[PDB]
Design a protein around this nucleic acid. Structure first.
Lengths: 165, 368, 375, 370
DNA sequence: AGCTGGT
DNA sequence: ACATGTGTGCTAAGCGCACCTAATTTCCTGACGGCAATCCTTACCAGCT
């Protein structure tokens, strides 16, 4: 898509104070603080009048909050079920692998709003394994259509494919 | 005539029921995962509840000969009892046998000890087992009995063991997406050592959910299996109402003391029962205002509205009840002012439902 | 007579219980995320407290042979105790019995007396050991907590028999749930690269999580079962109830307390007596939103008062009385001001509270129930 | 026997415990955002303090090779045979910040690690000269953590139980009110006119100002077990801790935010059980026109202290304490007087009162221990 | 006197 | 979900950061319980209709 790329690139332009106030708004809707809504409006309004396709609003808000909290860099080919699974091969299959594996499968049966904390723990173990790159555009357009089961099964089969290799 | 009893219970983080692997029970209701509590666990916990002790009169045992041998000071009859049972039809110490406790105790003791026969002794023991219907827990939960046809005698028969269940407990369906949570526990070794580690690193899974609990009484069946009397039937209905509102499943309560109480009672008298599972086909997602209990009650009251007008049964109206304690949780917050007798107690609703049952009172019936 | 204790405790920023990856234990109560402390944590903090030394007496261990050897002194005794205990049915793989075993401390002496007896054979000694272990129900810790011994069957001597080794628990503890909507915070730690070298950068960095919460804690104590498995020692049973109350009030879980010294006492305790256990976790289904005219602890106590008066109206107008001893320190926060009659006895002192509960159970004195101890 | 410290400070506009972004650290206490000074930061500023530069007996270093250096060249002899203990090398490091002393360690670790004596036979000497000492005050207060790796270390290392419990329990400093973050906009301006009238680098800084509450608890018999019977060094530890908690402040962005301030209230209690008077400030202090923030916070603290004293006490063992305000501008509110046993106007006399409770050790000859 | 439920 | 309600009359250009950083040991449970029937006959025979 040619609309989400501008959103991710504009997010990468954000300076320290803006993503600090985005960091402070974890688990909080974009209403109880005025500056957070102002920042989201500035990020989210001008990309609908230049390109016809835009992500969903809740996906954009959640992705902005998570991006502020973790601060990765955008790189093609680094979606969640590849780096996930790649880290699962670096594990003991007896005990820890079912633990981390269940932590990953918790994402596949959740709605967009409640995934903030499971995505937080998944990206926390990603940060523990020193992962710098994450395809924010790829994550965003597989998350804006997260409610159709073909993309969920494709994401899971990507995890399988990265695990068997 | 049959009685519906509905509850909406929110519970603390707890594991009231597990499968073989230890996970809380789950069902795919409405295309999403819903937390489940098994009906048999609820039936057992209400059976073993602290108010059913005046009415707890059913035993489900395979050690019948042990029960005979306990009530005999010096007359050892445990091999003779075992062979009498083994040619009764049970083949081994046996399979599971349902009966009344005191009846089998005393009169199987008197019918077993006498040295008058061995074949007809087994036949009359089997007849005593089959006639053991004077117990209302058997009348509620139900019981059949199937002995073997191989390890038996051709001269031993069995009467019709038909007992219908007068209770249909539904499985407690969660009112939202189930969020199964993983608990990580260790076991401390009390004495120290070099390793400074745990005695047993283990797995436990717990689920905090607002359960839609649903029971149903077949009062007509409850008296067609408890003979012509109605006093014991009214006492059992009141005892179940008290027990269900008062007791909880005895799962991992020592580790999760979730003894929270039902935040909703809906008793409606009709000849066509209904579960409000379709009240929560849409998963309940909470908003910033109110809480999960209120949103669940709101969706339930919306469903009660369009099944009291769209599916209206004004030939037999609803006598829909509540347990809203001093009106803490009202039902009709926007339109549903059809709760005819919204109260804030439990003995009052017990007395009311036995009043529409017939001419009974709460205190007088509580003596059978 | 079932004694229940409902505790509202406000805790500082702390991590008093955590999972494998270090996050504080969280639960989804009411559809929203609440921080959680496990019941095993408060249970063991009660057990390993600064007033329960006179009430100790249990070891849920896997190293019995070390204690029998320590009783034996300098008489070797490790190998033959090992082979005897393996002959009972507790198999060893590396150095220790492969299951937890729970048993009173005073039986160590006569267990070692069986072990050091060379006149007995093998199955006789193992059967005597199993008899001593299975009939060790002298402590109050096993009274409150429970027990199970199921010996292994494949590598077991056939001439070994066990009585009923299981005791039933007299203490029920719930998981402490946060009264308010709980959010976790993110802290990174650093190491001390104090000696300069040449990088002058970072030695170690990481990530830690914590949460502050107002907790609702539940304890449930039976009287007849606790005195039944304490063979009717009523002085010991009253001592257990009193020291348990003092432990629950005055001790906290020892999880990361060196970096988060959250040692805050309960700002409100509800001690009640009736036949069946009540619960007030549903008092906080809606999370507490802090407004400026009130406080978090004050609103938590107010919501608790609303629910307690609510189910006392809907539950506790019967022929069976329910009597409660509400405790706050010096009446900081009394009950709901719209009622002002819910509490039977507004208690301002914890020691006058323990005197009052000891007077209520059967009539007891702390100085007189302290005179009986099991250790 | 527990010695507890409760303090109240108030600093200027400051950035003491900033983020990697730059934002001063925040935590939620009672549902409202409060500025937090990290417990690790408080403990390290205590350890590195000027009045803690008479107690130090440990370093807790990372790469002990350069410290074991200063025959006159033992390396690549230090780092090369350091890998045998389970501490591999990654750009000449040890990959584990060993909790470990500094005086006897460095003075008796040269004799066995200056080559010779065979590899894996000096491994037991490494275990003896690394995992034994524990006779350091700050280490025994802060505990000890050690672990050898199993992948690279040989089986000839006999590592005993090096886990040592900590005798100290500090709590994160919490502001008494609602924290507010201030976004200080700032630029970097050029002075050479090599082009048009530009500036250079523009950006932001974030800071705050708050009134802080800090809690400490020094165990006594646990400390004297950790130091194994050294009474005077334990008195040195408690007195120097009482001085260093008050006189020393964190060292965050103090170059651009000089917020060195002294505590106007110090409360020391003597119980056999620990308490924390942080539930007093569940309600944030709303500053009124008739009083000040510090006085109001001290009044709320006195309310809570008197209340807990009357509710959780009247044992056979009373609770004795000394209250400290500088020159008595802030006595214990206007409520019930005589709550504290002694209202002390000077810090050294509060330290002396604590030391006289401790068993009768003074302040001057205790320093002669070290 | 046959019939039908049991062996 | 910037535009449009101008209302004497509302500027604006230059400028926005780089780098060192993430550790491990060990610890992980035994036993007991697991359903019977009934869905084509060695067919005549005697309880009695």
């Amino acid at each position: 898509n040619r609309g989400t790329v501008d959103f991710i690139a504009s997010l990468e332009n954000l300076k320290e104070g803006d993503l600090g106030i985005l960091r402070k708004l974890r688990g909080a809707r974009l209403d109880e603080k005025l500056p957070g809504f102002d920042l989201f409006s500035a990020l989210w309004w001008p990309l609908r009048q230049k390109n016809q396709r835009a992500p969903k609003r809740e996906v954009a808000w959640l992705i902005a909050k998570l991006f502020a909290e973790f601060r990765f860099e955008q790189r093609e080919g680094a979606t969640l079920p590849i780096l996930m699974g790649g880290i699962c091969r670096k594990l003991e299959p007896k005990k820890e692998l079912p633990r981390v594996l269940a932590r990953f499968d918790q994402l596949a049966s959740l709605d967009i709003m409640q995934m903030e904390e499971p995505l937080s723990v998944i990206m926390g173990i990603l940060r523990k394994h020193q992962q710098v790159c994450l395809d924010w555009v790829g994550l965003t357009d597989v998350l804006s259509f997260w409610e159709q089961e073909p993309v969920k099964r494709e994401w899971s089969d990507s995890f399988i494919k990265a695990y068997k290799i | 005539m049959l009685i519906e009893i509905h509850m909406i219970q929110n519970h603390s983080p707890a594991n009231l029921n597990r499968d073989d692997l230890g996970a809380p029970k789950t069902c795919y209701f409405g295309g999403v995962l819903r937390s489940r509590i098994s009906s048999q666990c609820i039936k057992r916990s209400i059976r073993t509840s602290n108010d059913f002790k005046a009415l707890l009169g059913g035993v489900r045992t395979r050690r019948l000969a042990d029960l005979i041998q306990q009530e005999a000071g010096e007359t050892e009859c445990w091999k003779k009892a075992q062979e009498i049972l083994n040619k009764c039809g049970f083949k081994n110490t046996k399979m599971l046998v349902f009966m009344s406790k005191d009846k089998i105790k005393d009169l199987a003791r008197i019918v077993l000890d006498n040295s008058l026969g061995l074949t007809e002794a087994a036949q009359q023991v089997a007849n005593v087992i089959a006639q053991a219907t004077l117990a209302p827990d058997i009348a509620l939960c139900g019981r059949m009995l199937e002995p073997n046809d191989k390890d038996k005698d051709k001269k031993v028969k069995w009467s019709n063991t038909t007992v219908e269940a007068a209770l249909q407990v539904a499985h407690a369906i969660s009112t939202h997406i189930a969020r199964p949570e993983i608990d990580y526990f260790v076991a401390a070794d009390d004495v120290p050592g070099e390793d400074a580690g745990a005695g047993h690193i283990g797995e436990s899974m717990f689920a905090s959910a607002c359960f839609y609990k649903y029971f149903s009484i077949d009062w007509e069946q409850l008296v067609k299996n408890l003979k012509g009397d109605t006093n014991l039937a009214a006492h059992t209905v009141g005892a179940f109402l008290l027990a269900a509102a008062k007791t909880n499943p005895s799962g991992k309560q020592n580790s999760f003391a979730a003894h929270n109480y039902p935040d909703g009672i809906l008793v409606e008298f009709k000849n066509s029962p209904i579960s409000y599972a379709n009240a929560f086909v849409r998963p309940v997602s909470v908003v910033k205002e109110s809480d999960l209990v209120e949103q669940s009650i709101g969706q339930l009251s919306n469903y009660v509205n369009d099944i009291r007008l769209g599916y209206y049964d004004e030939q037999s109206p609803v006598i829909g009840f509540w347990f809203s304690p001093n009106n803490r949780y009202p039902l009709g917050y926007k339109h549903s002012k059809l709760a005819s007798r919204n109260i804030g107690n439990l003995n009052e609703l017990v007395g009311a439902v036995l009043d529409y049952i017939g001419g009974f009172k709460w205190e007088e019936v509580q003596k059978s």
